[PDB]
């Protein structure tokens, strides 16, 4: 019964069978193939730094209605091109082209978050100062 | 293609007990079956039983008294070290203070409590409670 061998000397078939079936687990397969090195923009790191190319607004998905604020960024270590979200409303005035920004993942392990189509990353720091400190008026940003 | 004569015998006893019958017949017999029943009889789970000769491995008729909850076989007969006996009893028995695991050892067939007094081990056969 139960469709699997029970015999006392059947250990070889049991372990070989498990190896074949682990390839259906989604995160197991990612490790063993090394997908994060060969592809995806951060080559497996938690953060990356880039140069701002241009400023964009993204229309939210229906049923919500908003024009959300984003930037195009080129990553320094790869040259790959990416779009990032800028949190906290008026903070978009703190970023301008050829600024240098630090980016982080948008919390969903490579999926897009909420209303925003195709945006996977958010800005953390610009020109070496954190956006949270600027928004709360705790520090000042030098131009260049 | 009977792979285990012992497995068939205890399956027949379970099905009779569940429906409330007072007797059951099992075919064929073997030395191992007799030894297993004698242990069950010692602790009071079954009445007397009788063996019929036929020149062809015989038959047994068992009297049932309504005390048995379950009996069963473990297959394969895993090797058991003395330190392991405590794990099998935790998995198989319903409480710390009744029921038995049954072993074959080179000292004979016996329940797990006798094996501790004599300080022996071997291979697991089955359980009763």
């Amino acid at each position: 019964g139960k469709g699997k061998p029970r015999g006392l000397n059947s250990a070889r078939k049991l372990r070989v069978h498990r190896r074949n079936n682990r390839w259906a687990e989604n995160n197991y397969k990612k490790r063993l193939l090394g997908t994060a090195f060969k592809s995806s923009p951060f080559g497996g790191s938690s953060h990356a730094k880039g140069i701002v190319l241009e400023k964009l607004g993204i229309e939210s998905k229906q049923p919500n209605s908003a024009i959300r604020k984003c930037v195009r960024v080129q990553l320094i270590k790869n040259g790959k091109k990416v779009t990032a979200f800028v949190p906290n409303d008026g903070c978009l005035n703190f970023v301008d082209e050829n600024d240098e920004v630090l980016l982080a993942g948008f919390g969903r392990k490579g999926k897009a978050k909420g209303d925003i189509p195709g945006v996977r990353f958010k800005v953390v720091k610009v020109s070496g100062v954190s956006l949270l400190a600027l928004w709360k008026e705790k520090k000042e940003k030098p131009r260049s | 293609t009977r792979s285990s004569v012992l497995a068939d015998a205890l399956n027949a006893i379970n099905n009779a007990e569940k429906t409330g019958k007072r007797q059951v017949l099992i075919r064929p017999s073997s030395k191992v079956i007799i030894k297993f029943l004698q242990v069950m009889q010692k602790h009071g789970y079954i009445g007397e039983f009788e063996y019929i000769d036929d020149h062809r491995s015989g038959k047994i008729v068992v009297q049932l008294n309504g005390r048995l909850n379950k009996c069963g076989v473990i297959s394969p007969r895993f090797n058991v070290k003395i330190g392991d006996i405590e794990k099998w009893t935790a998995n198989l028995l319903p409480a710390r203070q009744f029921g038995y695991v049954i072993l074959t050892t080179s000292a004979g067939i016996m329940d797990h409590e006798e094996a501790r007094r004599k300080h022996v081990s071997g291979k697991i056969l089955g359980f009763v409670y």
């Binding site: - | 409330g20 007072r22 007797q23 009788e50 019929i52 008729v61």
Partner: protein, 81 residues
């Protein structure tokens, strides 16, 4: 139903079961003494014979085979042995 004696079945119920399913197995065929009308020579015949058994004294035939029991010829006399 719930209580019955499995060791002492009644003779009548035992007689109707299939030969392999009685409490102990056993055959239900038997042997016959047979005499032809001519000779004195008795001979022994199996009740489910497959061969056409002749007499010993001469090539007169005593039985013929069928799908089951053998058919004894006309004029023969027999006794269950």
């Amino acid at each position: 139903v719930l209580v019955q004696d499995l060791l002492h079945p009644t003779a009548a119920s035992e007689a109707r079961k299939h030969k392999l399913k009685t409490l102990v197995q056993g055959p239900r065929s038997y042997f016959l003494d047979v005499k032809c009308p001519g000779c004195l020579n008795i001979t022994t015949v199996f009740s489910h014979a497959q061969t056409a058994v002749t007499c010993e004294s001469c090539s007169t035939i005593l039985c013929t085979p069928t799908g089951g029991k053998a058919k004894l010829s006309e004029g023969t006399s027999f006794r269950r042995k």
